[PDB]
Structures are given as structure tokens and as C-alpha cells.
């Protein structure tokens, strides 16, 4: 019950701020480790 | 908090968002005039 609260109070924070966090890792990714973001599809 | 309130819905689905809250509220504010009345007292420390 307790724990069906906090996890449901938790899927709503993340799924509300999915794109922001998604943008700023590929930011953090693209300034830090490499600029070539094409990992998927690669190697052909 | 067993109903559900609903209103106007002011932002738009013009982006591929993944969800929204869908629960909207409103508050009104109004202002009226209506020359009330007003009691006179003297005041215990100075008479005045």
C-alpha cells in the first residue's frame, strides 16, 4: 500500500520529465565523450 | 479529491509530449462597491 504510493508518486515525477532529461544527457554525451551521436546503425 | 474537476484547457497538444495533467481548475475574482457603513469611537488613551 505505502510502497504502492511511493511508486506511483515516483512513475509520475519521471514520466513528467522525460524529454528535458533525455535532452540533457545527449547534451552531456555530446560535450563530453564524443560528437559522432550515431552508435545506433553503425557498424555497417 | 473523489471528483474529478475540469475547465478551459489552456495549452495544446502540438508537440510529441508523452503525457499531461488533464485537470484544471478555476478561481474568480471580482471587486463590487457598496458604501457600507463605519462606527465612531473615542479612543481611551487621548481624546481624540
Do not use: C, H, M
Request: net charge negative; proline share 4%.
Amino acid at each position: 500500500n505505502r510502497l504502492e504510493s511511493i511508486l506511483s508518486r515516483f512513475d509520475a515525477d519521471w514520466t513528467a520529465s522525460d524529454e528535458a532529461r533525455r535532452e540533457a544527457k545527449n547534451d552531456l554525451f555530446f560535450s563530453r565523450v564524443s560528437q559522432w551521436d550515431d552508435w545506433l546503425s553503425q557498424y555497417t | 479529491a473523489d471528483d474529478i474537476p475540469s475547465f478551459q484547457n489552456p495549452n495544446d497538444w502540438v508537440f510529441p509530449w508523452l503525457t499531461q495533467d488533464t485537470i484544471q481548475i478555476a478561481e474568480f475574482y471580482e471587486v463590487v462597491e457598496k458604501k457600507e457603513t463605519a462606527f465612531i469611537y473615542q479612543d481611551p488613551v487621548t481624546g481624540e
